[PDB]
Ligand binder design. Structure first.
Ligand SMILES: *[C@@H]1O[C@H](CO)[C@@H](O)[C@H](O)[C@H]1NC(C)=O
Ligand SMILES: *[C@@H]1O[C@H](CO)[C@@H](O)[C@H](O)[C@H]1NC(C)=O
Ligand SMILES: *[C@@H]1O[C@H](CO)[C@@H](O)[C@H](O)[C@H]1NC(C)=O
Ligand SMILES: *[C@@H]1O[C@H](CO)[C@@H](O)[C@H](O)[C@H]1NC(C)=O
Ligand SMILES: *[C@@H]1O[C@H](CO)[C@@H](O)[C@H](O)[C@H]1NC(C)=O
Lengths: 357, 357, 357, 357, 357
């Protein structure tokens, strides 16, 4: 038998196969099963609020028509051109941008027709989808990105979309992301859509991403910590040289604020206060406080010199010098402990919060 | 009865349905009713002066022709391909950029034909529209963005566009914007368009947006305030160390001006003066003034030392030292009160202005 | 009479109307009149050297053919599809980039055919055109942007383009630009084009734009002026504290140069020197000079102390102290006047120059 | 004989050549040989993680059909239009983005048909491909970029892709890259692909790139080194002037941290620590240490002055002054040697590592 | 005679003119002459390494067929639609990106057919081409950009491309570039291309560009020079105030390095060292040296004070003070001369190098 004659006889002009009519017309809804494979992942940034993912989509649906039953081979592979003739289920994404088809040399379309008439439709597309990311705790957070598939033109009746029981979602082997760690759970659930026009079927896929904490520490935590240590050490020493101390304090504050502003640049603007903000604020507060401590000591010293200028003045010389020294000596030991205890408190609360969430 | 034979018989070659002729030709204008649903909102920035909104557009118009009256089911769903054959009303937007149709797998088009011949036409498109935003008061403002729909090719006679009395505009459930809060009023009004060629119908939709004040405070108000406090405190203490004071003042001024310039970067250039500008200017003025106060005190001290170099000089020693001290002592208490009163005045006037507008 | 039969009879297969033949073939050139309406203006920046303008273009030309003379109504509105059949005059822009047609729902095309056969062709397009902007005086300048329309395929003979005597160019009501003020003159002139291939008709439209001076003052003039005042005041006071003075001078210079470099960033690079450059250079020169004045005074003081170390030395003590003081006292009063006179000179010359140009 | 009659007779309606049927149907897989020539290379950046390469692709496959055997000339050149009629093997790239065909004047397609029926298919395309670059050692690294060719629609059976034994990959003469040096090895290997649908043939090409070290030294190594030298020299001198020393140290630290942050900007974020990070950290540590050394000396000096204020005090004057001087004198000579030895260690270990890898 | 009947008779179905056959088949190669006119030039930047040029391309080739010889007029103008029917020579560019055709209202195509059958084909296109720019000497350099035209599908035999003897390349009148000055030489040469497939004809056009030196001086040379002068002057004065001197030196160095880094930003990274780099390095070296000179003087002064603390000490007081003063006095006069001589040497060598190259 010739292949060409069969190929046109099955889906051509002699065949009553109209691509405008749904299969099993005036009948029970056509069940469609969807299998998704992730070729690659990437392009995730906070400002953009979207992720670009390359995916291979497989759609399988039963067709009573086109059941030739005259060829020994179980299935027949077919060309991309043949797909236009066949009836195709509509697919839409709830948050779809871009998604242009790849057409290098030939369109990337695969058609397989089984003897029973089950049809496999395969396409490769790059989807950019909006992700409603959570910016609550910037250093450590878990982000879930959801992909939703709906039927734009058909109601719940006459077309139902279902997930594949085994191997519904696959991922490319040895695929990694520089910023996030993908979690191997991939929970899938389906939520129907209600509109004024009607009720439309939908299915959802959920992906969990974990941030890598390594970059943030080196980029932000380490410089701030070194700055804080420098300020404290320098402030405690060179007490007699008051211009030297005040100049150091002010420069340290200026660097702290500029660094904090620099830190808040890559991410977008939100009303709520992030953990990084909290850390910057406390560090700035400590650096701020140090200068006030020096100012108080300088004021007390000024009082001592003026009164001395005014035995009766050595009656108060020991008192004022001892008081000022008692301030400096206590402050010097006191501040790192009252900083270490906060640092420990901060890390433990965030660690338990991440563990429970 | 076969579906295919009916489907071509209704809108094909045997039917005199020409897609080049308006329905009810030489007759009263065709009333078209439009329903708009907002899938998503986003991409609003001052420099761009545009907003990107994903929308679902439903157009309903009465057609005397295509009233088959031979099928028991009330309405028939139809394919996107069928739409080209049917006559379609022209739609244009007064400020339209981009707006390319989404065509993933199949074009996102829905056609529903009722027995009476009313036709529902549904399309999903992303429109970028210019918004004439008001930049009067940068921290707190209400922005209204308007969307206008007009008929490019047809005059007021032979095509009229009207709003749906109930549920004219719907919004996606649980839809939020990071920067703005959408207001649930959505006032709709229609303004006709007059041109040299003729009079064309139009309809307008108005959306109200409220800025979130949380980010601006942390980003700008808090650093400026800390800087101002540091400068005042430091200036009042370490009075004897004049190089220390002058150096602090100058560094503080330099940070103030650079921060102000940095603040004026995200937004575009306008002739009028914004509230943020006013706040930066007063803070800079206070920081500026402090240095002049120190300079005056230093000059008086210089006069005291030169005259002393010249009892007759202790006749004026008490006077000059007392005068200089009286300056420093009064200035020190005086400046925060004369700053707090302004801050209170500023916030109350802006709060009443936002409330009334 | 049926509309469809007439519509194909007028411009179809029975009609000898070939869209490949120019009307009035072997005859006098076809006069075409063009009317332009500006929907919106915007996107003007120095670096890009182009402006994006949305425009509605109306082309009117006389056609002897298609003069039906059998329908009572004076004119017939026609669909966009009908336009392809009709012969259309070629239009080109001398400096055209982009200019993609807007095609939302239906193509934005209007066709009107009068009984006499005059044809009105209407299109809406967004044109990006290069503008040869003048960057001579950055703060105040008048920019003229020219739009040129030419016939790419046809010579001067057989197609002439002319302007409409009344209402040739219209602008959208209540249309404003944030940076520039449009001038309501809109002088139109036409210049023919000569090429090796032949002579081609062209028409030109000129638009005048005036810069808003409000933003530039606040952004650049005010910070530089405050810096200059601070430097002068601080330099004159705290004369005894030489490290304090030198440190202030150097920091002030560093801010001046960085601010000047920052200023020269938004605009492109040009050989000629702009007014803003002149202002920055003089301000930098004044700030520069101040330090040299302090250095000279310090050198004289050094000479006084060394000679004193060497009555015979109080013979020269009064002379050296008086000379140094005479320098500081004169310099202090002298510099603002010699700055105010320049500022007055600068503004008056630029104001007269802008007024005359 | 006429050329036109032959040209349609060979591949037209009288010929049974259907472009929907694979050659040698129900037969051994069709061997396809691929030759690749690199027109140009460029656009390689770390953030993008992709490279843009212009390539000329030659596909040669045996066809039993179209073996005319009636023309004396060995091969016939054919037009791009003729290609659509012929059956064409599908080609896909594992990591393909963009890759739009170039179509200036005519499509860039070459067809050559030999007498035996071997067919040469030639196309020019620009491919952007993701490269999994290694960011372990930023200054010196070797990057390998892989290009993979697979058959999307056909399994391993019925289409096999093989490399050309001689001159498989050619490069344009005199082609250079500013950043990287291409290595003339170009190892080619093929790895089959296994999927749920089936087994698909693939071939891989590997390119080796070597970074140029010249820019990085001047940009980063030289400024850091000069800064370190300045800090050490300045710290050792001007020991009596403690405010001068502390101010120098702090400014030097501030520049070091800002420079380090600036350095980490061009490249993306990764968890692991790069060599440049290690170099910045040690330099910052040295600069940091210097200040602590000065602080310790200042503290000892303070102890000496307080005890002196309290012979019995000249019993300890020599001891304290000698101890402080012994610190400064040893530290001064000690630090460059303990810096030179590290620098030598660093360079030798990286040089051996690059040589072995 | 009717025009339509002739127009289809010449190039239609009755005519044996097949657009798939080369003219003069089995005959001598078809000579094609190319004329290029430059509408505009622009978009040249170092990072991009490409230039965008708008060009009008004229192709003239002899056709024996289509020689009607029955119309009195010498040449017939024809529509863009007619071009598809005619055989067209393939054109390709060696380094072509973008180059999309402009299609506003009508496609910008001109066809002219002479009586002898010579055919003129005219197209307007914007070509972005890679330019292998030389970055050896950044301030002054001459850049040559080459445009190459080749035949993708045809070998040297059967299609030859040649230049027009007179007026081969024309430029638009009054066309200027802000950065570069075009040179009116425009040397044209042709180099054949050899490939594995065959030998292909090519032609090349060379354009010479000269940089404008005005911007670079103001942007970079002037600030560096002022900084150098400030540092030298300030260092020489205020010798007794060592903290003041060291602080000035360090701040000056910090500005120098940041300015140098800022300078190296607009351009890309290259291994070789540019002239601007050389200038920055020497200026940094001078500024660096000054601090070391001050440190040496301070060390000598320290030696003098310690020995004095230890007549026998006034035996060495004169010697040490005289030596330190001799250093400062010589250094002060010595450095500008040893800077002026270098500046003169630098400019003369670059000027002769530019003149000879
Ligand atoms: C799809 O599945 C449901 C539940 O298994 C079934 O009731 C329905 O008939 C199916 N639809 C078909 C077979 O078209
Ligand atoms: C549209 O509505 C108006 C007002 O209700 C009516 O006068 C007009 O006839 C309507 N147009 C039709 C029915 O075509
Ligand atoms: C166009 O106008 C000119 C001048 O009015 C006239 O000479 C010419 O005949 C006109 N062209 C026509 C009527 O085709
Ligand atoms: C391709 O090559 C293999 C191994 O040389 C051979 O077995 C096979 O038959 C070939 N395929 C053909 C000739 O179609
Ligand atoms: C093209 O020119 C060459 C040299 O003038 C000539 O030999 C050749 O015959 C020409 N090709 C033609 C006329 O087709």
């Amino acid at each position: 038998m010739p292949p060409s004659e069969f190929l046109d006889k099955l889906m051509g002009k002699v065949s009553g196969y109209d691509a405008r009519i749904r299969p099993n017309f005036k009948g029970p809804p056509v069940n469609v099963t969807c299998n998704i494979f992730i070729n690659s992942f990437g392009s995730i940034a906070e400002t953009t609020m979207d992720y670009r993912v390359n995916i291979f989509l497989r759609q399988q649906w039963n067709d009573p028509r086109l059941a030739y039953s005259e060829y020994p081979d179980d299935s027949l592979d077919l060309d991309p051109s043949m797909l236009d003739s066949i009836w195709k289920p509509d697919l839409f994404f709830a948050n779809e941008k871009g998604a242009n088809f790849h057409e290098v040399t030939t369109d990337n379309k695969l058609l397989r027709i089984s003897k029973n008439g089950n049809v496999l439709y395969s396409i490769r597309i790059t989807l950019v989808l909006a992700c409603p990311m959570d910016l609550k705790n910037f250093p450590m957070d878990v982000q879930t990105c959801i992909m939703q598939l709906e039927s734009f033109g058909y109601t719940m009746n006459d077309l139902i979309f279902e997930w594949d029981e085994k191997g519904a979602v696959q991922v490319a082997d040895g695929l990694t992301l520089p910023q996030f760690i993908l979690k191997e759970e991939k929970d899938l659930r389906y939520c129907t859509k209600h509109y004024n026009t009607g009720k439309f079927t939908c299915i959802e896929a959920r992906f969990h991403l974990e941030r890598q904490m390594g970059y943030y520490l080196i980029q932000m935590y380490i410089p701030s910590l070194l700055i804080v240590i420098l300020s404290w050490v320098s402030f405690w020493i060179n007490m007699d040289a008051a211009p030297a101390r005040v100049g150091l304090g002010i420069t340290t504050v200026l660097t702290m604020t500029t660094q904090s502003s620099g830190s808040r640049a890559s991410l977008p603007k939100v009303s709520y206060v992030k953990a990084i903000d909290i850390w910057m604020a406390v560090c700035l507060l400590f650096v701020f406080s140090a200068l006030l401590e020096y100012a108080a000591v300088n004021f007390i010293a000024r009082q001592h010199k003026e009164l001395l200028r005014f035995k009766t003045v050595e009656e108060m010389r020991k008192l004022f010098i001892s008081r000022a020294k008692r301030i400096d000596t206590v402050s010097r030991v006191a501040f790192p402990l009252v900083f270490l205890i906060f640092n420990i408190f901060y890390w433990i609360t965030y660690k338990i919060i991440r563990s429970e969430d």
